[PDB]
Amino acid sequence: KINIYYGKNYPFLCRTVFNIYQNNIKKKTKEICVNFINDKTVVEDIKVEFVNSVTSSDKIFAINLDFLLKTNLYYFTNIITNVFFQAQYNEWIDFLRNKDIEKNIIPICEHINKHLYLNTFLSFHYLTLSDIYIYYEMHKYFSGNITTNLKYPKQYKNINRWFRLIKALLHDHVATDAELIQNLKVKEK
């Protein structure tokens, strides 16, 4: 039993990692249960309770969940290649750390668009935690739900192509949640 308390921010990355773990169990045929309780007394990050509590963030505690749940997104199920990726994910964390995403959306997209010119995935040649983290950060700009944001997919074709790929890969794990989906629409309201 692990309890994750969230407030204004919903842990999309942690929820997605947990959903992937659940579908891995349903297809492999003791199990660890992670609960996502909404607490009004948390401001912008997540507090995680182990059954003591700690304060973390969605971008960072998802690394812990991948370790625990063996979802094969951050910890691979050679080591030097694994360690190299872990530093690459840290590069993406530092790239958006304490940056206003909306204010710096253009410089962010310019780097991602050029990065995806000859790259299918953000890291290596397979889906990683880096792809999913940036996917939710770019979701409000490239999902096409907000009509005002349709200029980003047309101008940045590589991001739009990559965005469609990650969306399709996550379809079997996130499209049925109806709680992750609910928080996605609220975040774009």
Added chain:
Amino acid sequence: SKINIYYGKNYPFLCRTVFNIYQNNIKKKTANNLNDKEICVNFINDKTVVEDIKVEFVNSVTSSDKIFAINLDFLLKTNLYYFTNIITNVFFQAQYNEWIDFLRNKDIEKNIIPICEHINKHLYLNTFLSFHYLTLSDIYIYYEMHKYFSGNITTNLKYPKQYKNINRWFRLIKALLHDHVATDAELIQNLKVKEK
């Protein structure tokens, strides 16, 4: 395999200490085990690095000393961040990130008093920063607090007397790391340079 860490003006004490522990762990294996894959990590001084570390694998990545030590502990199995039950391990990993966030973008000199008051209290009831054994949290905070409790800088001699629990814990971590850091010379030299 080969890994090169390029540093500028900041010496990666945490990464150096982790690597030194790994080397002394190898020296205890080969000594008694005689019937039956070593990694070499280089600490190259580059003038064109400002405050972080550049790590090259032999493509390169950009990291920091406080964060890349987690990667080194994973690779070298030094038993400081990844324990070689799992939920308890995960709980510690979040605690180390709390210490990282506690000093993230904070001026250590300006907030030295509130930082020390926070650290002393935890230590009043606890021997180590995390759990009851030496962890990566202890070593990371040890080097951040080193210039204030080592007693080399005469103006900073007030801190050991005012915060005894930190001073107690600092003495312990220094003794535990003595077999791995006191013989380096290269690190000791950078300790003296940093503290002038």
